[PDB]
């Protein structure tokens, strides 16, 4: 990836590689090899931990589950996004 923003570049490399791997015949190796299956689950768990890291960054109060948590958090993020853009548009239209 030749994205001059390093984070976005790493994210797209992960997304594409995950997609490529899953389009191969993974089920075949899953049945044939126990080690393979456990290794994929370990990688999936790394992804979930990174998602949870970001979720904790957003819901900073700390004085199906992942999926539902992810959905509620996305609504919160995009509510902030709409708020911010509405403010930008309001300012430029009043100008």
């Amino acid at each position: 990836s030749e994205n001059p923003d390093v984070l976005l570049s790493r994210v797209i490399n992960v997304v594409r590689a995950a997609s490529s791997l899953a389009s191969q015949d993974v089920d075949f190796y899953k049945n044939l090899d126990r080690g393979f299956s456990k290794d994929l689950k370990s990688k999936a768990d790394k992804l979930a931990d990174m998602a949870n890291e970001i979720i904790l960054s957003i819901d900073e109060h700390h004085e199906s589950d992942l999926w539902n948590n992810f959905g509620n958090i996305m609504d919160n993020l995009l509510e902030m996004s709409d708020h911010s853009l509405d403010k930008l548009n309001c300012a430029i239209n009043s100008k």
Partner: protein, 118 residues
């Protein structure tokens, strides 16, 4: 035949390792701390959309590897995030248009000064 899958696994594994420090960097402080430190509203919007992009991407990558059959719900979140980013680009295009107009006037002014005196 069997050896065909291995480069795909290797590629994925390498991508994960490269990403991990970047996520730590991204989350070195809370989103609210980062937003409170920003004065520029457009920079706030970029940061918020960036979080949504990264989060939904991780979820997508996770679900591919778990071998989820029904990808419609997560692809819906990716469509949403892209749509939000295009909304932001359209605001940027509007700003750019008025920047260019400003640059045009200033280039005109400089030419007036330089030319007539010549």
């Amino acid at each position: 035949d069997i050896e065909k899958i291995k480069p795909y696994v290797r590629s994925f594994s390498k991508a994960l390792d490269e990403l991990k420090p970047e996520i730590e960097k991204l989350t070195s402080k809370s989103l609210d701390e980062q937003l409170l430190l920003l004065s520029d509203e457009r920079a706030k919007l970029e940061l918020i959309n960036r979080y949504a992009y990264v989060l939904s991407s991780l979820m997508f990558a996770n679900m591919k590897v778990l071998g989820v059959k029904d990808m419609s719900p997560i692809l819906g979140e990716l469509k949403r995030v892209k749509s939000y980013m295009d909304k932001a680009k359209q605001y940027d295009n509007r700003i750019t248009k008025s920047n260019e107009k400003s640059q045009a006037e200033q280039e005109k002014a400089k030419n007036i000064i330089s030319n007539v005196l010549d």
